[PDB]
C-alpha cells in the first residue's frame, strides 16, 4: 500500500503554525522520487538523509507535520534556528534527521481583502522543546498581576494574525510547509521505500 502523502500535500486546507498538523505514517511503501522528482516546491532541504538514498531505507514511523507561515520565516524551519516561529510555534531538534518542504501558496492562502485565518503564537514565556505543540489561548500575562481572561495593560492575547495579502512581497506571502520526520526505534520498521 502506498503511504498517503497525497492527502497531506493535496490538502485543500492547511493549519496555522501555532497548531501545526501532524500525520503519522506507518505500514506502507513510499516513493520519495515522486516528491522530489517534481520541482513544484521552492524549499526542499533534507537534514541527515539524502532524498535519492531514501527509497532503499526503512523507518518504524514517518511523521508529516504541515502548517502555513510567512514566506520569509521558512528559514526558521531548520535545526538550531531562532525567531517567533522556531521559538514559539514549531521547533526542529538540533540532531534532526528529516526533510523540510515548502511551496508558495499566494493563490489559496492570500484572499482578496486579506486572510486572517492564519495566526501564529506571538507571545510565550519560554521556548518550545522540539516537536512540542502549544494550543493555549489563555490571556498572556506580561505583568506580575493576573489577567483573568481580558486584554489590557500587561495582558496580551497570544495568537495574532498574518495579514495574508496577495499583492505583498514574496517574503510576506503564505508558504505551505511539510516537515518529514524519519524515526527508527527498536520496533518493526514498516515504512519502506521500494
Amino acid at each position, epitope marked *: 500500500n502506498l503511504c498517503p502523502f497525497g492527502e497531506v500535500f493535496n490538502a485543500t486546507r492547511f493549519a496555522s503554525v501555532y497548531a501545526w498538523n501532524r500525520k503519522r505514517i506507518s505500514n506502507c511503501v513510499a516513493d520519495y522520487s515522486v516528491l522530489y522528482n517534481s520541482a513544484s516546491f521552492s524549499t526542499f532541504k533534507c537534514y541527515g538523509v539524502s532524498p535519492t538514498k531514501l527509497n532503499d531505507l526503512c523507518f518504524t514511523n514517518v511523521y508529516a507535520d504541515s502548517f502555513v507561515i510567512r514566506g520569509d520565516e521558512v528559514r526558521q524551519i531548520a535545526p538550531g534556528q531562532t525567531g517567533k516561529i522556531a521559538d514559539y510555534n514549531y521547533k526542529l531538534p538540533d540532531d534532526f534527521t528529516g526533510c523540510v518542504i515548502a511551496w508558495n501558496s499566494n493563490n489559496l492562502d492570500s484572499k482578496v481583502g486579506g486572510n486572517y485565518n492564519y495566526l501564529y503564537r506571538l507571545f510565550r514565556k*519560554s*521556548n518550545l522543546k522540539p516537536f512540542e505543540r502549544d494550543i493555549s489561548t489563555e490571556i498572556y500575562q506580561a505583568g506580575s498581576t493576573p489577567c483573568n481572561g481580558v486584554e489590557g495593560f500587561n495582558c496580551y492575547f497570544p495568537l495574532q494574525s498574518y495579514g495574508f495579502q496577495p*499583492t505583498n*512581497g514574496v517574503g510576506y506571502q503564505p508558504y505551505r510547509v511539510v516537515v518529514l520526520s524519519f524515526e527508527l526505534l527498536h520496533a518493526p520498521a514498516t515504512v519502506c521505500g521500494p
Partner: antibody
Amino acid sequence: EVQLVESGGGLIQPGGSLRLSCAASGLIVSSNYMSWVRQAPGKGLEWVSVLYAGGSTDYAGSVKGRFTISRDNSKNTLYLQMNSLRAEDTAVYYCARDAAVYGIDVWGQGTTVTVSS
Amino acid sequence: DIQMTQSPSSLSASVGDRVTITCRASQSISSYLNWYQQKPGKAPKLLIYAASSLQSGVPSRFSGSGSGTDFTLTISSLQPEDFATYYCQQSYTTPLFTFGPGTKVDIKR
C-alpha cells in the same frame, strides 16, 4: 510603578565599551520582548537589538557582533553591552518593552552615548 | 523589509485647527501600525496602537485611521501641548519594527 529607568551612558572613545542598564518596574522584562532603540541627533528612531521571553536575541547589522543584549531576572534589569564602539553609535539610547500589536507603550527616559576620540 | 513614509515632513497649524498626518507602507500592513509623539529631549509616547485603538492616558482628540498601506493620525483640536513630532511604527514584522521619518507640527504664523 510602570517605569523603565536607564543609566550607564556617557563619553567613551572608539574601540571602547559600555554597559547600559534598563531597570524595570510595573512589568517583567523576562516575559516581554525588550528592544533597544537609539536616536541620533535630529535623526529619528532606529531599532538596535531585542531579546524575547525565551532568551533569543537579535540585533541590527551595524552592531551585530559588537553589541550584546541580556538581563538579570532577579533585579528585573535589562542590559546592553556595547563593545568595539564606533562614531556612528553616538546617539540617545532608549529601552522599551514591545507589546507587538499593542505597540511600544513603555519607553525609558533615555541615556546619551557619545563615542568620540 | 518594509519602508515607512510620512505625508508632510513639516506642517504649520493653528491652535484649534484639525490636523491630519499621513503614513504609508511598502506593503499591506493591514492595521498593524502604531503612532507616537515626541517633544525635543523627551522620549516617544504611544497614542494609537493597531491603526485606530486609542491608548489609555492620551486625550480623546487623537483619532487613528487607515487599514492597508495608507494610514492617518488626526488631531481634532490642536492644543498648545500638541506641537511635537509624530512618527508611525510598524507591528507587521515584530519584534523588528521600522519607523517613519516623522512629521514636525509647528505654530502657524
